[PDB]
A paper describes a structure:
GlmZ stimulates translation of the mRNA encoding GlcN6P synthtase in Escherichia coli, but when bound by RapZ protein, the sRNA becomes inactivated through cleavage by the endoribonuclease RNase E. Here, we report the cryoEM structure of the RapZ:GlmZ complex, revealing a complementary match of the RapZ tetrameric quaternary structure to structural repeats in the sRNA. RapZ then presents GlmZ to the endoribonuclease RNase E in a manner that directs cleavage within the base‐pairing site of the sRNA, thereby inactivating it and silencing synthesis of the synthase (Göpel et al, 2013; Gonzalez et al, 2017; Durica‐Mitic et al, 2020). The protomers have two domains of roughly equal size: the N‐terminal domain (NTD) bears Walker A and B motifs and resembles an adenylate kinase, while the C‐terminal domain (CTD) bears structural similarity with the sugar‐binding domain of phosphofructokinase. Here, we have elucidated the structures of both the binary complex of RapZ:GlmZ and the ternary complex of the RNase E catalytic domain (RNase E‐NTD), RapZ and GlmZ, using electron cryo microscopy (cryoEM).
To capture a precleavage Michaelis–Menten state of the catalytic domain, the active site residue aspartate 346 in RNase E‐NTD was replaced with cysteine, which changes the metal requirement for ribonuclease activity from Mg2+ to Mn2+ (Thompson et al, 2015). We purified the recombinant mutant RNase E‐NTD, RapZ and GlmZ and combined these components to reconstitute the ternary ribonucleoprotein complex in buffer without Mn2+ but with Mg2+to ensure proper folding of GlmZ and to lock the complex in the precleavage encounter state. The ‘fundamental unit’, comprising one RNase E‐NTD dimer, one RapZ tetramer and one GlmZ RNA (~ 314 kDa) was refined through masking and particle subtraction, as will be discussed further below. Thus, the interaction of RapZ:GlmZ with RNase E does not involve conformational rearrangement of either RapZ or GlmZ. Previously published crystal and cryoEM structures of RNase E‐NTD have revealed many degrees of freedom at both the quaternary and tertiary levels, enabling flexible accommodation of substrates (Callaghan et al, 2005; Koslover et al, 2008; Bandyra et al, 2012, 2018; Dendooven et al, 2022). It may therefore not be surprising that in the ternary complex structure the 5′‐sensor/S1 domains of the RNase E‐NTD have adopted an opened conformation that can accommodate the binary complex—a configuration not previously observed but which may account for the capacity of RNase E to be guided to preferred cleavage sites by RNA structure. The ternary complex assembly appears to be stabilised predominantly through mutual binding of the RNase E‐NTD and RapZ to GlmZ RNA. The predicted structure of SLIII fits well into the density present on the surface of the RNase E small domain and RNase H fold.
Author numbering:
A (entry chain N): 147 to 154, 175 to 190, 213 to 393, 400 to 489, 497 to 510
B (entry chain L): 2 to 395, 399 to 469, 480 to 490, 498 to 502
C (entry chain N): 1 to 5, 15 to 43, 54 to 65
D (entry chain A): 58 to 96, 111 to 282
E (entry chain D): 58 to 114
F (entry chain B): 172 to 228
Amino acid sequence: DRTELKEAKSAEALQWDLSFRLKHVIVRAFRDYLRQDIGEILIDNPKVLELARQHIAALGRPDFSSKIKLYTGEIPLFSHYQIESQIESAFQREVRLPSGGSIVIDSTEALTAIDINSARATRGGDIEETAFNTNLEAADEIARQLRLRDLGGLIVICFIDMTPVRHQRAVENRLREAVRQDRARIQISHISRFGLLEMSRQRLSSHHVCPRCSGTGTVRDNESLSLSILRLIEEEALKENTQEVHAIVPVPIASYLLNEKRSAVNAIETRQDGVRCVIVPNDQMETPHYHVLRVTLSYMLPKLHEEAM
Amino acid sequence: KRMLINATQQEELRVALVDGQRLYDLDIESPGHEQKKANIYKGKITRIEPSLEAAFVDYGAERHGFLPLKEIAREYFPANYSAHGRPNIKDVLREGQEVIVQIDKEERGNKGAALTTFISLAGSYLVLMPNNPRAGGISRRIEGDDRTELKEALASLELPEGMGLIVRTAGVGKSAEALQWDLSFRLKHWEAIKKAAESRPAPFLIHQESNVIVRAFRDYLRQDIGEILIDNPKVLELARQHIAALGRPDFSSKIKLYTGEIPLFSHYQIESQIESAFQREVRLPSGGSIVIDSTEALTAIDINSARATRGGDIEETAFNTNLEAADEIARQLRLRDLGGLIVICFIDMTPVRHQRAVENRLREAVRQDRARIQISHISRFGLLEMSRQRLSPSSSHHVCPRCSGTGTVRDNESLSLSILRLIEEEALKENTQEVHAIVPVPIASYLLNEKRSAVNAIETRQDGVETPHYHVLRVRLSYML
Amino acid sequence: MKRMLRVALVDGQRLYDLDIESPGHEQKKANIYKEAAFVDYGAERH
Amino acid sequence: RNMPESPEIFEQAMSNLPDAFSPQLLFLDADRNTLIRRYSLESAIDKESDLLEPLRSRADLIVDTSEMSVHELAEMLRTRLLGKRERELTMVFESFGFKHGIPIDADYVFDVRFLPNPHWDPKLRPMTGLDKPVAAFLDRHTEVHNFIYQTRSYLELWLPMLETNNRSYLTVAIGCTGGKHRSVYIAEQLADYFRSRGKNVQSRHRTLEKR
Amino acid sequence: RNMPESPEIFEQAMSNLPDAFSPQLLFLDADRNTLIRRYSDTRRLHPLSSKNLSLES
Amino acid sequence: GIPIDADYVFDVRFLPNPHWDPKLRPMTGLDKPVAAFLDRHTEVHNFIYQTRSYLEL
RNA sequence: UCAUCAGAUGACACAACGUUGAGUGAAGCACCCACUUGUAACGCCUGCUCCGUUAAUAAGAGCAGGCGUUUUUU
C-alpha cells in the first residue's frame, strides 16, 4: 500500500496538514495514541473539551472523534473509581502482586535495577514452582509498570532463582511476549549464569535528591562522625598560616564531640600549639551536613558563617 | 609492603596495608560488631532451672545467657556427685558461684544466649580443649600420610592429663616442634587466663576476638610485609602478643612502633583514599569518575570519566580510562567490602580486543584478592556482571529519615495533588462526615492559596464532610490534634 | 473497553499508558518557539 | 472423530447416562501457534472449532492452557475435582551421607548402599549425581529402576493418611555413604515422580550444598 | 487393563464380529528386564497391584 | 531424636493413635490391652504387612 | 516435669588404561574471537615507593602536592 502512495487519509488529505508544519503537547498525547482504539474520552472541564473540539479539526478525524464527549461521571469510566490504583502505583517504588509477590523498582545512578520479591507467605511450599508462578505474574507486571513509570535504559532484573533451565527459558519467552503490544525500542537478552537479566531501553521522552544525606539512601553514624570530623579538624589544624579554626556541625554532633570527648580536643590544642579551635552546633544543619573554615561570639558566629555559606 | 595501625582513640580501630604511600586493604573496626562468639568471660549463676535443666548466668547486661546441663565441667559439680541420670542442677551447684565461660552462640533470638563450661582455644595450627578431654582427632581436610604422619607427630607431643586437642584444618603438620611451640604458648595463655580470672568474683570479659589481632595477623598479615607500625604503644606489647607467639618471630624486625609527632595515616597521606572508601563517587586516579551505588538488590558502578565537556580525546583514551579504572574498582571493592551482585557500565568501544583487554585487567586484580569472585563477559549492551562473595559475613542508618533509602524528593506540587485526590476518595466513602489529616507544613503553605475554590468544590461534592510523613485519618484545634 | 480520562489511557479494564502535565516539556530547539567553539543555542556548554 | 454431526443426539444420550455417574465437561484453549509447538494449520482448526463450539458453550470449565504445564494442569485438576484442602503437604527429599549423619529432622529414610555404585568406574568418581554421565550409568543398571519404583509405591500407599491431619511437611531422606552419587540420583528422580502426581515437592542435596 | 478374568468373554465377543471384517491380531513382547526398564515411564501401577508382590511378580 | 544406630527409619505417626483412650495412655507398649486396640484396627495390619513386603524385597 | 498436636572421632581402602568412544560434566588455568558499515607559572618541601650511585644516612631522579605568593585561566 505504501508503494502506491509514494508517488501520491489520502496524500491529497495529507497535503492540508503539510502546509501548517512547513509554514511553521497535550494534543501530542493524542499523537502518542494514534491507534485511537478508544471510544470514550470524557473530560470534566468543558473548556478542555471545547479545546479538544478545536483539536478534533487539527487532528482531522471527526469519524474517530464521534464518540468523544465530556462526561460528568469519572467513576463509571473508573476515572474516579478503578484507575486510581495504578495512579499511585506509578510512584510506588515497590508493587504488590495479585500473587502477593512484589518488586523493587530501584533507581541506581549507574543503571536501573529491579529485584522481584516472592509473596512471603507464612510457610514455604513447592518454592521452585512458586518461583516460576510468581515470576510469571511479575514479568507481566514488569512491562506495564515499566512503560507507566516512563523509565528505560540499562535495565536489569534479578529473579527468584530458577533451577529448571527450560522453564527459565519459558519465562524468558514470556518476556519476549510481554511487550509485543508495546510500541517502543526494545531488545531483550537471556538469563545470567548469575541469574540476572539484561533488559531493554525506554528513552523515548518530578523529583530530586532527598533533603537529608543529599540523595544518599543511608546516613553515616554519629559515633562514626564523632571521630571523622575530629580527624578533619586536626588535619586542617596543622595547615600553616592558620590562626584559628571554625567548625559548623548540628547539635547532637558537637555534643558528643566536646562534652563527651573534651580530653582529645584539649590534647589537640596542646599538640597544635597556638592555633585556636572553635566548634559551633547549629539547629538548621542536617545530621551529615555541616561545614568547616580555618583562616564573633563562641555562641554567635554561625550567623556570620551562614551568611557566608 | 607497609602496614598502618591507628589506635589514638580506642573506639575506632583503623588498620591498613599501604603499598608505598597508597592504602590497599581495609579493616576499620566498626564498634558494635560485637563478635562476642568465643570470648572467655566471668559471672555468677542468675537462675538455676529444674524445668529447663539449665542455669542463667549474668555475663553481661542484655540477658542472663544460657547453660545446658550437659555442658557443665567437674569444677561446677560437687566433690560428692551422684549418678541417678544426673538431672539435678541444684545438686550440681547452688547458684551464685563464680564462673568460667566463653561466648558460644551469638544471641540471635529472644531466647537467651548460649554459653558452655568447656572453653576452647583458637590457635593458628591447633585448638585446645582445656577441660573436656573427649574431643580429639584431626579435622577433615587434612588426610592421607599427612593424617597418618601428623597422628604420629601429635602422639610424640605430650599434653596435660585430661586435655583434648583438635588440629586446625590448616594441617601442614610439617614441624611437630611448631605444634609443640604454639600449643605450649596456648597452654601458658590458658594458665594466664584462669589466674587472671581469679582476680575478682564479678562478671568480666577474660579473653575475646578482635580484628585488631585475630584477623590482623592470621588473615591480613603476610610474610611479604616489610614494615609494621603501631600508634598506641599500650598495645605494642599486645602486639608482642603475637610477635613470636605465632611461632614465627621473624617479624621482630618488622615491628616499628610509631613515634612521630604526626598521626600515622597522614604521615603516609592516605586519608584521601580512606574518605573515598565512603565518599559515594571517587574521582578516577588518572582522572574522571567511578560512581558507586547499591540498589540493595544489587550494586552498580559507572565510569563517566575524562573530566571534560568539549575537547580532543579518543575512544582508546576512554578505553584507557576503563583499564586504569578496573584496578581502582578492585581497590574500592575490597575496601568497602562488597559481596553479592555487581554490575558495570564500562563505556563501550569498537575494539573488541580492547574489551578482552579490559576484562583481562579486571581478572588480574581478582586473582590477588582474598575473596572468591565470579566474573562474566561483557554484555551486548555492555553491562558486565560480576559477583564476589563477601569476605566479611558481618539497619546501619540504611534509610535516612527523609530519604527512606530512596534519597528522592516527591515534588511539593505532586505531593499536594496526591493528597487532595486521596481526600476526595476518602470523602465519598460511606460513613464520612469529616476529613482530618497531617500534612508537611511547606506543602500546605502553597497548597490552599492556589486551591481555595478547588477545596470549595471538594467540599461541595461530598457535602457533610516531612514529605514522607503524611497520614490522613477519615472521620465517620489543628495545633492540638 | 478502552477509555481516556492529568491524562489517563485505560485499555479495556487495566491502564495501558499514563500521561501527566509538568512545567515545561521535551521539545527540540524552536519546537513551539521562534565550527565556532562557543555559540548561543540557549546555552554555550554544547 | 467422536464429534457427532448432530449434537442433539449428543445431549440426548448424555441424558441417557445413569444418574450416579455425574458428567462434567472441560474445554481447553491456547494460542493458535502455541498449539503448533505441541503439534492446514489454520483452517483445519477453524472449521473444527466451529464443530467444537457447542461444547465450549456446554463447557463446565474452560481453561487457557497457552502457558500451561503438566504441574499446572495437575494442580488445576486436583483442585478442579478433588477440591482444595488448605491442609497440604510439601514433601522434602533430602540426600544425605551416612558419614556426615542422618538429617536432624527426617520422617522416613531409606539406605541405598546395596544398589549398583557409580563409584566402580574411576572416570565417575569426581562427577556427582546431577552430571548426566552418572545419571545414565545408573539408568542402565535395572536394579536402580527396580528400587526407584518399589519405593515410590511404598510412599504412594501411605501418602493419603498423611494428608489428613494437616501435616505441614513430610521429609524423606535417602542416604548413600558419601551422599554424592546414588542418593542424589535417587532423590532427584524419586522427587520428579511425585512432582508429576502434582503434590508439592522440594529437593535438597545436603552434601553438595555444603559447598 | 481391559483384561477380563473370564476367558470366554473376548471369545464370544470375537464371535459377534460383524461384516466378516478380518480380525487380524497384533502382539508385542520383550523380556522381563526390558519390560521393567520400560514400564518405569512415570506410569501408574501395574493395575495388578492387588497386594501383588513386585512389579516383576 | 533419631537413634544414631538407625539404618532405616519408618515413621508410623498416621496410624490410629491409641492415645485417644485415656485408659490405655498409662499402659505401656507391651501391655496386651494396647495390643488389642491395635489389633482392632486393620490399617495396622496393612502397614505391618506392606512394610514386611518392602524389606524382604 | 509423664504424654498429644502443631511450631572440630577402629581397621580399612584408593594400581594397569583396555572405563576405551558406552556417559564428559563441576570448579579452577591458559589461549582464541565475531556479523549490519546505523589553568598556567614559580615558592619552598615537616617527605612517600623506588632506582642510581657512593656515602646506610647524605646529597640527589620522579614530583597524587595540603598550601604561601603571583599573574591568571579553567
